[PDB]
């Protein structure tokens, strides 16, 4: 009886992580997607979303969170009934800290870095969907916040280290799981908020153009299967489906 | 035409100073106080507020805002229609670092810290307004965020300091202003930011019994004079008149 209330921005990485968090345990919330299809100065979201997509708030009941991260635990810690599936295994399991890991590990890239570096050196990036004249506005605009190509080649091959800690798991995963069962997620058979980070973060590197040159066409293979399979996944397609298309607003 | 939607605790310090920016500055508000008359374990609001009054949030539009300095300086820097009063000096006017300097100075306080001393510690207090009871609730609970007197007189301490920076300024105010003029409040004519933290800190303070302490009876009495003049501002009675009394929920 007691309603569940969220407002976000729609494209926001923040708040695409809250959201398929409540699709994904089943939960019903009443959303608001704040964002406007057309800003002050006449752009459309995928020209604003740099810091500009900051955070986004839970209100149930008589509580009131603001951050994704600590939304996302709300919901957990909350929401306890049998029929509501768990992403995370029992605070004291056995299992525990190594899905703790892999989430904190992906949730402190520095996402808004690496849509500020792409709008602004396209160069270093493949098949980017952001259009060209973005990288024409921003610049347009001027005359660690700045557009060192130095720093972006430092923390794109920072990523690319993250990456490998995960290829690897996802290995070991593969080979520990017999083909024609049931083909486990990053840390185990169930899909965790260690998936829910992992799902989103790279579905925003398809949007900035840092697949190509992550994943897939040889490299990393087990990465480029997990990402092609939360494509499919009905929670993922419904919340995220269209997150991506610049021609729905 | 563009709605402007809080949520808060009607008892919570910091939603106090939010909404009473909003009736100062004239804000037309679509206020919600999610708090209820009755917890989880039966208790009333002057039997829970500690940290269990955490954060407010304010939503315009497509903005998000969270905690209450941050969202009083969103109000501050939006609304800026010449019907809308400023609370705040120009911020390169020659009075401005002054009035952020006691503004800065009342909201660093730990108010938290006081009213866990004071259910706590009644002993340090004179004419508590919450039930001696409370005493007796939150301490069966058992069996810094711990209960050393040392700690409390030490802080207790503390505030005298404050306070007598805010006498004396008080004290500068009224000599420089004649009789039969009009009253200036602690920065000047105007009332500012500073002057919103003080009215809802030191109604705080008389709520928890530390008010005998610290004025009146011929103690800092350019500072009793102040506190009883927001009581009968229109717009503090409005907002908090009924903040105070335990028989409203």
């Known amino acids: 009886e007691v309603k569940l209330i969220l407002y976000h921005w729609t494209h926001s990485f923040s708040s695409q992580k809250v959201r398929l968090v409540i699709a994904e345990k089943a939960l019903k919330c009443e959303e608001h997607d704040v964002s406007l299809p057309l800003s ?6 995928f020209m604003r979303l740099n810091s500009t997509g900051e955070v986004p708030v839970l209100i149930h009941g008589e509580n009131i969170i603001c951050e994704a991260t600590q939304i996302i635990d709300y919901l ?40 500020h570096g792409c709008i602004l050196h396209p160069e270093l990036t493949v098949d980017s969907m952001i259009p060209a004249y973005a990288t024409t506005r921003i610049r347009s605009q001027i005359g660690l916040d700045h557009d060192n190509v130095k720093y972006l080649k430092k923390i794109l091959d920072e990523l690319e280290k993250v990456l490998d800690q995960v290829e690897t798991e996802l290995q070991r995963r593969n080979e520990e799981t017999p083909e024609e069962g049931q083909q486990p997620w990053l840390c185990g058979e169930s899909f965790t908020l260690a998936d829910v980070s992992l799902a989103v973060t790279l579905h925003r590197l398809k949007f900035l153009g840092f697949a190509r040159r992550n994943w897939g066409n040889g490299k990393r293979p087990n990465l480029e299967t997990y990402y092609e399979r939360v494509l499919k996944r009905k929670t993922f397609n419904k919340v995220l489906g269209h997150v991506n298309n610049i021609l729905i607003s």
């Not at 002050?40 to 979201?45: D, K, S, T």
């Not at 295994?89 to 890991?101: A, G, R």
């Open 40 to 45: 002050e100065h006449n752009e459309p979201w």
């Open 76 to 115: 957990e810690q909350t929401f306890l009934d049998e029929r509501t599936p768990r992403l995370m295994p029992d605070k004291e399991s056995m299992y525990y800290p190594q899905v703790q890991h892999y989430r904190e590990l992906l949730d402190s890239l520095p996402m808004d870095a690496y849509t």
